[PDB]
Design a protein around this motif. Structure first.
Motif, PDB file in Angstrom:
ATOM      1  N   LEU D  39      58.381   7.497 100.593  1.00 56.71           N
ATOM      2  CA  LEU D  39      57.579   6.302 100.290  1.00 56.71           C
ATOM      3  C   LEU D  39      56.108   6.518 100.646  1.00 56.71           C
ATOM      4  O   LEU D  39      55.806   7.201 101.627  1.00 56.71           O
ATOM      5  N   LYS D  40      55.172   5.959  99.875  1.00 57.34           N
ATOM      6  CA  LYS D  40      55.420   5.136  98.692  1.00 57.34           C
ATOM      7  C   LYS D  40      55.232   5.925  97.398  1.00 57.34           C
ATOM      8  O   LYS D  40      55.663   5.489  96.325  1.00 57.34           O
ATOM      9  N   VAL D  43      57.980   6.852  94.371  1.00 57.08           N
ATOM     10  CA  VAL D  43      58.888   5.833  93.818  1.00 57.08           C
ATOM     11  C   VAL D  43      58.915   5.814  92.292  1.00 57.08           C
ATOM     12  O   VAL D  43      59.979   5.691  91.691  1.00 57.08           O
ATOM     13  N   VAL D  44      57.745   5.942  91.666  1.00 55.78           N
ATOM     14  CA  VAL D  44      57.676   5.881  90.200  1.00 55.78           C
ATOM     15  C   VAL D  44      58.302   7.128  89.581  1.00 55.78           C
ATOM     16  O   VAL D  44      59.144   7.045  88.686  1.00 55.78           O
ATOM     17  N   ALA D  47      62.032   6.970  90.064  1.00 57.36           N
ATOM     18  CA  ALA D  47      62.674   6.010  89.160  1.00 57.36           C
ATOM     19  C   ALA D  47      62.860   6.629  87.779  1.00 57.36           C
ATOM     20  O   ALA D  47      63.951   6.540  87.178  1.00 57.36           O
ATOM     21  N   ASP D  48      61.823   7.280  87.282  1.00 60.16           N
ATOM     22  CA  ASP D  48      61.921   7.867  85.950  1.00 60.16           C
ATOM     23  C   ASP D  48      62.843   9.077  85.904  1.00 60.16           C
ATOM     24  O   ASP D  48      63.619   9.228  84.957  1.00 60.16           O
ATOM     25  N   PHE D  61      65.434   7.118 100.319  1.00 58.92           N
ATOM     26  CA  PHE D  61      64.003   7.151 100.564  1.00 58.92           C
ATOM     27  C   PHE D  61      63.739   7.352 102.045  1.00 58.92           C
ATOM     28  O   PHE D  61      64.553   6.958 102.879  1.00 58.92           O
ATOM     29  N   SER D  63      60.312   7.173 104.944  1.00 59.77           N
ATOM     30  CA  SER D  63      58.892   6.880 105.183  1.00 59.77           C
ATOM     31  C   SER D  63      58.464   7.674 106.410  1.00 59.77           C
ATOM     32  O   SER D  63      59.052   7.528 107.488  1.00 59.77           O
ATOM     33  N   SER D  66      51.991  11.131 109.111  1.00 58.97           N
ATOM     34  CA  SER D  66      51.263  12.186 109.815  1.00 58.97           C
ATOM     35  C   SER D  66      50.336  11.560 110.848  1.00 58.97           C
ATOM     36  O   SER D  66      50.439  11.856 112.032  1.00 58.97           O
ATOM     37  N   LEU D  72      59.279   6.857 110.160  1.00 58.24           N
ATOM     38  CA  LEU D  72      59.199   5.401 110.163  1.00 58.24           C
ATOM     39  C   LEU D  72      60.470   4.765 109.602  1.00 58.24           C
ATOM     40  O   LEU D  72      60.903   3.701 110.062  1.00 58.24           O
ATOM     41  N   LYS D  73      61.084   5.446 108.648  1.00 56.81           N
ATOM     42  CA  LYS D  73      62.372   5.042 108.094  1.00 56.81           C
ATOM     43  C   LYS D  73      63.079   6.310 107.638  1.00 56.81           C
ATOM     44  O   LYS D  73      62.561   7.041 106.810  1.00 56.81           O
ATOM     45  N   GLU D 151      45.260   2.773  98.639  1.00 59.06           N
ATOM     46  CA  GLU D 151      46.343   1.889  98.185  1.00 59.06           C
ATOM     47  C   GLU D 151      46.258   1.352  96.744  1.00 59.06           C
ATOM     48  O   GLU D 151      47.186   0.674  96.311  1.00 59.06           O
ATOM     49  N   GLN D 152      45.179   1.651  96.010  1.00 62.47           N
ATOM     50  CA  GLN D 152      45.021   1.206  94.611  1.00 62.47           C
ATOM     51  C   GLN D 152      45.494   2.264  93.614  1.00 62.47           C
ATOM     52  O   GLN D 152      45.590   3.440  93.961  1.00 62.47           O
ATOM     53  N   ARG D 154      48.381   2.863  92.112  1.00 62.11           N
ATOM     54  CA  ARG D 154      49.731   3.431  92.135  1.00 62.11           C
ATOM     55  C   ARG D 154      50.495   3.045  90.874  1.00 62.11           C
ATOM     56  O   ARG D 154      51.363   3.776  90.448  1.00 62.11           O
ATOM     57  N   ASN D 155      50.170   1.892  90.299  1.00 62.49           N
ATOM     58  CA  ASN D 155      50.915   1.368  89.158  1.00 62.49           C
ATOM     59  C   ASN D 155      50.363   1.795  87.800  1.00 62.49           C
ATOM     60  O   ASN D 155      50.837   1.330  86.754  1.00 62.49           O
TER      61      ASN D 155
END
Lengths: 171, 164, 166, 164
Positions: D39-40, D43-44, D47-48, D61, D63, D66, D72-73, D151-152, D154-155
């Motif tokens: 993550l993150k 993910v895309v 998915a594909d 997944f 997380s 560094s 973290l997960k 953080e921008q 990603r989509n």
């Protein structure tokens, strides 16, 4: 012991139908957030990942994505969001709502952080199964209470990667 | 540049833990089971000493957390619904974090939720959090020890010291 | 369906913690600073008591792992491990399977040194030969509780170690 | 800054078919494949890609952050005795992936392999084995398809170069 196949899967909702529904949901979400500049989309793992990946690519504007992992038992946070929530427009994205129990507890926890707005989007809804009145803003398909898998939904951690939604059918 | 001087001795803490335990034991005398929950890292020493003095069917658990935002780095492992829950904290000053934790736990509908702190700095309070059991009420001193750190050090001091 | 019977008193544990601290303090005489890392939930009482006897610049941290079923990290340490002297603090070693995985995970982070301390050791249970530097008590394979060790989450708060008589 | 398409959604799609054919041939004989993404960013791509992989497939997944690579997960799924494929959007330094691969190797998977959509070989600071690579690219400043800048982006359905 050799284990013979005990079930099969039959397509219930095709990849193309899902694609169509995502176009509709995106039109609804984009319209709903027209006056919003930034949107944070939060998916619940593992089931929301495929849906979130497809949907987020159709949402306009400054979009950020994040994920949480919670247990279905109290709802325990196995992984919290990494983003700040307070004062933000937040959209929870989930593959399926049935009982509503988990989503309602997640909604309540997030509301404590005082987002500017909190909305819920589910691709699939089994309204028959509802046990608590959780408000869902955007709904893809309304489906009967069938044994379903695919597009993020597993059975015994299988079938999550099917590009369509299938029902699991005994021989 | 700085040094430490003893403010509350190990012996004074030991005596106050007996006083806290009697209040807690009297409070939960009729309870089926008690779950004690500490926030990492500061609560561990206090929790370790206190839980050894608490009677009955006691379970212990821990959470890790880091304005209305909070992030849960580790949630409790134990069930909360319908149980008596006591949050155990080394020090309450602003109360900001504790209030957020209390609110989240209340959603899980414990039978009861209470808070015990070894130290309370009431002059520092920024939010009205209900505190059920208090060891020592102190001025806003620069303090370390008995789980409380300065830049991660001094948590292992057996006493509470003032940093001078 | 069960009762308890004292096996090691709180007084005996206190005495042994003095012995362990003497060993640890002598071992780390030349060390700039020590990170003590305890495994949740079982190590918390032992850690609390022991850390108060350890000299020098001491820091404490905790991790939560699932029992060996892989050993998964439910909560990692918050502190940096690379280039630190690190002491893992555990209540009990039996199979060694879990502690072996934890040790391996921490070795991957390249600490300056890594050592392991267990209050209790059941050596007849050992399935993997994890090296342990400091050991409190060597005990028979008895059904035990107390001083951090649970049976069905109960008895962690007993100030002594007790045998459960089923 | 502005953005400019470097790899189109259609180009990514074509390459995912190529990658899927390689992966499907490599794991034709596998009882269980577990695909693990970080993550993150992954993910895309995950998915594909997962929708094109045949057989019994589970996804999971992790997380990590560094400074040491802290978990973290962790994965929820079992690793021991299973075929595992780590799925990553981009490999540049390789530092984080190398630590992740090492941690997963401790759990004794039947086999462990790595797939990345993008590789910047000139950025490599550690020798991590990569089994499947989509596009080999120069060290361009890039976003999209899961990769962020602060953080921008990603989509974005395509991979864009950031032009300052």
């Amino acid at each position: 012991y050799f284990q013979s196949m005990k079930h099969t899967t039959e397509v219930m909702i095709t990849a193309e139908e899902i694609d169509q529904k995502l176009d509709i949901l995106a039109e609804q979400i984009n319209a709903h957030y027209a006056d919003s500049d930034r949107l944070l989309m939060v998916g619940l793992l593992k089931g929301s990942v495929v849906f979130m990946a497809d949907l987020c690519r159709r949402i306009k504007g400054h979009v950020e994505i994040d994920f949480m992992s919670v247990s279905s038992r109290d709802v325990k946070i196995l992984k919290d969001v990494q983003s700040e929530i307070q004062g933000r427009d937040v959209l929870i994205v989930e593959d399926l709502i049935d009982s509503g129990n988990t989503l309602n507890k997640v909604r309540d926890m997030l509301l404590l952080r005082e987002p500017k707005s909190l909305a819920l989007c589910t691709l699939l809804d089994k309204p028959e199964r509802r046990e608590v009145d959780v408000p869902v803003d955007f709904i893809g398909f309304t489906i009967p209470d069938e044994f379903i898998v695919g597009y993020g939904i597993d059975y015994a951690e299988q079938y999550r990667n099917l590009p369509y939604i299938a029902k699991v059918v005994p021989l």
